[PDB]
Amino acid sequence: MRTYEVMYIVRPNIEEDAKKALVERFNGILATEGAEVLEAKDWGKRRLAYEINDFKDGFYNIVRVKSDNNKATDEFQRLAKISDDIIRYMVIRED
């Protein structure tokens, strides 16, 4: 009942099997109690408008998640920070 959109960046300096491994794990983290993933969009690499972490480029991912009990995305918000394949991320509600 709360349309959680999340979207995140992946570091450019990886190999592509790991790149299609992260999109498999983090869409299984959201798969706990309602995935509802209507788009796993690899809206691809651009030059982001400034510089972060000596990285001039990034790999975006756009994920839509619908849920009710709203426990699910906070597992992502804990577990995405501690790793370092994701330089920035957002979760934003919409109803």
Binding site: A49, R88, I92
Partner: protein
Amino acid sequence: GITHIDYKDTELLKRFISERGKILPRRVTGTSAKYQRMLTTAIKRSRHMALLPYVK
């Protein structure tokens, strides 16, 4: 009459930032008031995911 604006909009906000990197006032641009409240809550979370820059 244009509908509501998210920060997935890549370039729709860029015509309303200045060439240097700051917002335009409503006096300068000439739209309504509510629309630019949606701008000021849109373009900032555009800056948080770096689709639009801080300073040129």
